Design an enzyme around this catalytic site. Structure first.
Site, short mmCIF file in Angstrom:
data_model
loop_
_atom_site.label_atom_id
_atom_site.label_comp_id
_atom_site.label_asym_id
_atom_site.label_seq_id
_atom_site.Cartn_x
_atom_site.Cartn_y
_atom_site.Cartn_z
N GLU A 1 2.88 6.07 3.97
CA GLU A 1 1.81 6.99 4.35
C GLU A 1 1.91 6.95 5.78
O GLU A 1 1.21 5.93 6.50
CB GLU A 1 0.48 6.63 3.85
CG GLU A 1 0.34 6.77 2.38
CD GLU A 1 0.00 7.91 1.67
OE1 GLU A 1 -0.46 8.85 2.36
OE2 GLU A 1 -0.10 8.27 0.46
N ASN B 1 -7.66 1.33 10.90
CA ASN B 1 -8.64 2.25 10.65
C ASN B 1 -9.32 2.16 9.31
O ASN B 1 -10.55 2.72 9.36
CB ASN B 1 -8.33 3.79 10.95
CG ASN B 1 -7.20 4.26 10.05
OD1 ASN B 1 -6.25 3.52 9.56
ND2 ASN B 1 -7.17 5.38 9.45
N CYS C 1 -6.03 9.37 9.68
CA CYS C 1 -4.84 10.14 9.64
C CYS C 1 -5.09 11.57 9.30
O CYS C 1 -4.45 12.27 9.54
CB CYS C 1 -3.81 9.19 8.57
SG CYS C 1 -4.64 9.41 7.14
#
Ligand SMILES: NC(=O)c1ccc[n+]([C@@H]2O[C@H](COP(=O)([O-])OP(=O)(O)OC[C@H]3O[C@@H](n4cnc5c(N)ncnc54)[C@H](OP(=O)(O)O)[C@@H]3O)[C@@H](O)[C@H]2O)c1
Ligand code: NA
Ligand code: NA
Ligand code: NA
Ligand code: NA
Lengths: 499, 499, 499, 499
Positions: free
Chosen positions: D261, D166, D295
């Site tokens: 993450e 992304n 996210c």
């Protein structure tokens, strides 16, 4: 009594308190009468040191004291401070009594100050979140390559602690604590108005192990203290008092490290958003506590149109329902002011407000040479700025109340005084609060509570005429400490390849 | 020239430099002659502002400037400082020339200062390792439960930057940089002796985007500056100069935040351990650089018995092999001193040392009203303390050399002067070095190198008569910034269960 | 005995120690024999919890414990830790006895560990130099203008403390202290080899006020602990043990916060500069203390040509003059190793060194199933790297000694092992020391002293195979705490003008 | 194109992108097709390295790279990062194009990411507010008297940067920046799905001066990367991706420093207090930006009874008025999802919500193999918890909307998901906000704004299944750096008297 067993001189029927000359209690200068504001009667005498004794004391502090304080391991200094806390604690009642006796402080307040002094001492552990130093690598600049820096904080040496009258015990303990925890020697100069609590604290510290040559307690009246301030052996002056005296101190001292807590009042702002019960309660207290003899006392109340009426109404009721009398009655709320002069000024100040359009909403009646009712004076925004109660700090239980259009006018008026110690803001809207926080020119802002420096859990200090620098656990280090930079040069040696 | 294209007034054949009054260049006070120490000839005139212009300038800085500086996003302030660096850089030669012309600074040194000023500006990014604030939870005390603290640093407002003569460009840029990076407005007051570089720096900053009402450059001679220092709109005074003037500044200013870099010389200690080549090289430079017109100049050399002879021998050879002349010759090592008076004092001082048992080992010959050879004077430990060169800072290229028994005697003598700026220690043994570091009462210690504040990569400042507080990237924030504490009270609300 | 009055089950003549299941002492899993290394005799039994009890314990810790720990004011958590210190202190002898009984620790060492545990608890006050948060202004980027950040540290929740055998009391107390001071709940999993001290510490903590549902002590043997590590309710695993088990822990746990103190030995470097008396003394101790069952034990000695002989000579004499026997004799220097297996490995390892060119210089004789003399084995640089004593950590009192040409060879050999916990360097030259400090790939370097993590006054941890992260007062916070960022957006509201 | 002039292989009509093997571009492993999600057409091929090339690359990074990175002065590393920023900036359009081409990112978003990458690089200056170390005096404990500690941060060595699909450009630049600014060598492993931007960034860095042996870019598909993660020469793994893959990474890597993450969605809470215009705007964007492939995307909307209707109404209108199409039209709002599979899951997820009582309020229509309308699904609190859209992160533009009774229910539902990345809260009441901030178990809370990690001006990271540790300017240092403690022992030497 108690701790000062073999120290106090029973002479002429009145107890005589001697100065502590960094090694031995004594003094041979003029004896000075110490009176209680409760009855204006002499309760003791203090021996001021002679010029030669001041000279000798400073010499001892400088030549021996600063090393005794510095050479005592930090872990031991803390032990001393903790032992002293223990001693003061078990002697609580005697300490509280003297605060009531000598400062005219209401019983519960006196107990609160003893406990504050005790807690402050025990929290010296948290004053360590600052004595650590910094390591600076030299590769962030080409000129400093193969070089390194070490920055440590070191004590300055001899710190002069000058205390006001309103919190004789705590201030002395506080200034001694943060000055000593870091390794400084200390010269305490209490208000001649109420030097007894300091004598007791100092004694408790000496009994706790405080290096006997690293501390001094000199009972010198006002201007006689300039001799301490102007002396080159005094590296720092921690001063809490009036703007005018602080100014004189700096001018007498010259280049030196300073902490100037110069007070002044604090304005309180109430937004249409505020819980008025909480606001009235806290504001009433902020106005009267210790007969307004608090630098963080509320002196101006600003409330928006929609809540002004109810707010001032509730504050007025709380003030008028206060019992004024002997601080000895656990029933009394407000004891006397420190002197009749202080009351004179408060009455004149009220007269001024009334003459300029002001209206008393509560109190206003003098009850004796040193007694008065905590007063709340209403005033129109268009005239409040020229009133003495606004332009000045009238050290007494009195505050102006002013209706305002919106937050901007509240802030404008709040910032219109020459002081900038704290400010209180009651409300709930984060945006309005954030804006108030941005525009209020003060050292500290209390959201939904009266201003309360307390034991300095949170740092506080002034802006504008309220002084410079901060006191507080962990922050006071800046004023009684100095950096020492050590730069190591390894250029050419084979430590580093390229970096 | 260049940047000051439309600013400088070509009047009477001599260039006339105007003061910058926070908005427009001008002034209508007395015009003052600016002379070069190279030939004692007038090279320009500066217009000092009249009392009304000083008043108006302060009013603008206070009412508009501090907000313009504060309201400019930190990211933009940095952009301004970086653009100004670019401008000064491409105008390097003109800036260097003025330093040579006006300060009598050797070509390479002048270039070094321009580059230092440029680097200092660009490193403003590293001055941010300090504007962040603290969050303080309230559960470490029962009284503060359900409470929280936020401590932020805010600019003070208007900072007065007072600069000495020896580093006119850098000091101005430095003080402006750390005062501005944090949001303050600045009033620069350069030495009337050499105010030209400041005018150029200020101009470069204004061209770079510096808020036009947030800066001022006033060409006021000495005591005329007290008007700026004493004014209540000036919240801080950043001063670099003599101990005596600094003292006067504080006494005139009163309560205010200060940074007092009061110089004095620096002692250098050489242990039997030291690389004598490195030591002689660095010590020689520390003695003569910019004709000793450096606060961090070496004024006293202390070497242990076993290396004293060789060390002083090598330093003497280096000094005597120095070329003294026009700073314009990339061949000259030492230009003239700022004034003939400065040279007079150096000669008298040398005479004093010789009369008291001292012996010149190098130099000692005056070469003109403002020229002299960098001098090294030997002196017996038993008599050096009473010599003017020891007890005072003779701002010139001259240092005492003294043989010592051991480290303890070196330290004793090093600490015997009334100053405590820096100190240098050449040696290799970690224990001896650590001991020297502990006992040397100075703001900074340089291990195996001459003292060099440089651009302040490492913080520096004084102890004893050398002043108070520190300058340096990241550390100067303490002097031009103030804390703002915000306490939030959530007692009773349902935020916390028990904690 | 004592504290465990009503807890310990007197069954079958042997004391039975139950697990603490976050609320009640008990357990119904297999009972396990706990033997003393002094005589290999069973001294007690511990009840391991059943799978359902482990499940229930984790459920309680997660659903109630972490909140009980978090909701207890920091000031109260500290009180608990201080009370527990008091309890352990007055029960010192019983605590020391168990350390001698169960761990085979020499009397004085056992007393040292109890005192260390007590001090660690009392210093929890200094673990606060870290729970404060940060305030981040948003004007250092255009995208973040009119925005602000608040970064606070919060406890993670349930921390699993896994302890090795060599410091059963301290490790448990240490991990519990730094995990709890910040608000975490804790599951202690001691070595089944010597779980008794932990049971006593936990009991002392529970008696001190430790939230009963916020702590658990599970007597699970090795691999049975994976059930705790792999569980999602365990947010962090504080592990001190072998490289191999640590690896298994991470692989079983998966994503989670970790502190892996994986030990390995430490090399000691002696420069021609070193005080050989100090060096021999400290190195000898570093080799034998607690029969080398210290992660910070010296396993390799490297000395330069000019001092190698004398150094190894002195170390050999000190080792051979050591009394090996019952840790109960205040006369014995070295007690037994934890198990006969540990001794087997040490003998095989010595055999390996000798076969590869090594020569025993002191000790080398096994004295029983669990007793051996602390041994020093000499080895040529050209062959030491292939010896088991070098490539591995033989947990026993044994170290290699190797002569080296210069510092570079010392560093090379020191870095040649797969571990990187600490390293010791004895010498005086600042340049050589600085170079060693730069090139030694380890978590901690001790200058002029044996490696001694002590109570963690200074942070320590590994590099390479010695693990990741650090323990230490103030530094352990990173492993059992997590940041919580709060960003406030004020874009568009009238808080800021432009900034 | 451009930067990759001589690097890209024009073979078989399709551009072939080679891996960068820490020194030379190349590779000889399987070639892999890189497709655009815009048309599912192959736009290039990347050469994955063979096992021997991976081995050789790691060997180079370890044996040469970490030293090249470490030995390059910090000031130079910064110069490299700034030059690379310049290069990427002037090549903006080409960088943006590839983001649109390869990631299906809308033109403006692609431009935003290039600018973010550029800013991140330039702000590396602010990553220095952390590489400084600590100095620890030893006199706060008796055992440490005459001792001192120096704690410095050092780079770990080789950091493996594993990037998701992304934000291919930013993530690579970000991880490389914070890993390199501190002195680490870096192995970048981009998503095989869109590795082109990384190749361009790496190239720009190499052209900027990045040590050629200190960086590597390996085009390895998923599980093939385990070879990098499991290798002992890799000291740290910076991973951004799915919870499941992150778990696998840790289990493959074992003991090592990690930054995980692991995303998941973010819940948004709207109090009756909120500005619904702002709330609807920000929430709509948080739901659809980059087709929800963020996210920090909003996946759950919780609003109190009194504002639920209007809020969801406005959000629905904004979503349905979105233009879905070719990211090349500066007119399109939402491009395609990364793969048809991603869309399949979103449709199945919507079906699940509807089957369980859910109702689509906007969107819901698939528009092609990789195109769908950003969808908003309403759901009753009593059933939302069992819906896939709640229990899982459906990486797509879709969010649940749920009406709640009060803040407590909002918090309960917000905390009910297995993730804990960020959370958004729109409202104005400080007490409710403070309570939400206390009870929301997430790494970051955004007050009055959509969650936006941005360039990491403010630190962010996860709680619960969202991972461990934080990224952000200044905070990422913890994951790619290690402490080195240096303890100096001066006991017995004459440095200190008593302290
Ligand atoms: N500590 C440090 O870091 C440091 C660094 C560099 C230099 N120094 C010291 O500074 C001195 C060199 O500069 P200098 O010889 O020019 O010293 P100075 O005379 O003390 O410099 C004083 C500065 O203050 C101004 N000034 C003079 N009287 C004033 C007054 N009454 N009120 C307000 N401002 C006044 C002066 O302006 P005019 O020039 O117009 O009179 C000048 O700009 C040396 O003693 C050196 O050791 C210290
Ligand atoms: Na003075
Ligand atoms: Na003043
Ligand atoms: Na897991
Ligand atoms: Na591994």
């Amino acid at each position: 009594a108690g701790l000062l067993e073999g120290v106090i001189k029973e002479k002429g029927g009145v107890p005589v308190y001697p100065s502590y000359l960094a090694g031995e209690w004594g003094g041979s200068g003029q004896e000075i009468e110490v009176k209680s504001p409760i009855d204006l009667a002499t309760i003791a005498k203090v021996i001021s040191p002679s010029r030669e004794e001041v000279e000798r004391t400073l010499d001892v502090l400088f030549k021996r004291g600063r090393w005794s304080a510095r050479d005592m391991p930090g872990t031991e200094r803390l032990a001393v401070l903790r032992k002293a806390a223990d001693i003061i604690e078990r002697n609580l009642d005697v300490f509280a009594e003297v605060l009531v006796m000598n400062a005219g402080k209401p019983k519960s307040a006196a107990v609160g100050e003893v406990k504050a002094a005790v807690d402050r001492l025990r929290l010296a552990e948290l004053d360590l979140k600052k004595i650590g130093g910094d390591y600076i690598p030299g590769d962030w600049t080409y000129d400093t390559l193969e070089t390194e820096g070490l920055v440590r904080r070191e004590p300055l040496g001899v710190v002069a602690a000058i205390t006001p009258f309103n919190y004789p015990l705590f201030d002395a303990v506080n200034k001694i604590t943060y000055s000593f925890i870091y390794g400084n020697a200390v010269v305490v100069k209490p208000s001649i108005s109420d030097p007894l609590p300091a004598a007791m604290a100092v004694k408790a510290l000496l009994d706790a192990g405080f290096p006997p040559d690293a501390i001094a307690l000199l009972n010198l009246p006002g201007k006689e203290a300039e001799k301490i301030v102007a002396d080159d052996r005094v590296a720092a002056v921690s001063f809490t008092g009036s703007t005018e005296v602080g100014e004189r101190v700096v001018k007498v001292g010259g280049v030196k490290q300073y902490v100037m807590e110069l007070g002044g009042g604090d304005p309180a702002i109430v937004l249409e958003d505020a819980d008025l019960d909480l606001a009235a309660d806290k504001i009433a207290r902020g106005i009267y506590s210790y007969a307004g003899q608090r630098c963080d006392a509320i002196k101006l109340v600003l409330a928006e149109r929609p809540v002004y009426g109810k707010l001032v109404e509730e504050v007025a009721k709380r003030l008028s329902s206060l019992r004024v009398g002997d601080p000895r009655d656990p029933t009394v709320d407000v004891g006397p002011l420190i002197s009749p002069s202080a009351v004179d000024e408060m009455m004149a100040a009220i007269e001024d407000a009334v003459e300029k359009g002001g209206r008393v909403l509560a109190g206003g009646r003098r009850l004796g040479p040193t007694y008065v009712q905590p007063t709340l004076v209403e005033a129109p925004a268009d005239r409040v700025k020229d009133m003495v109660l606004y332009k000045r700090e009238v050290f007494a239980p009195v505050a102006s109340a002013v209706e305002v259009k919106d937050l901007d006018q509240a802030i404008e008026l709040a910032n219109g005084r020459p002081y900038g110690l704290d400010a209180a803001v009651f409300g709930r809207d984060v945006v309005k609060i954030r804006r108030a926080v941005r525009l209020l020119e003060v050292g500290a802002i209390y959201i939904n509570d009266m201003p309360r420096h307390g034991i300095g859990y949170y740092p506080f200090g002034g802006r504008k005429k309220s002084g410079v620098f901060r006191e507080g656990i962990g922050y006071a280090v800046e004023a009684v400490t100095a950096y020492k930079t050590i730069v190591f040069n390894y250029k050419g040696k084979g430590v580093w390849k390229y970096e």
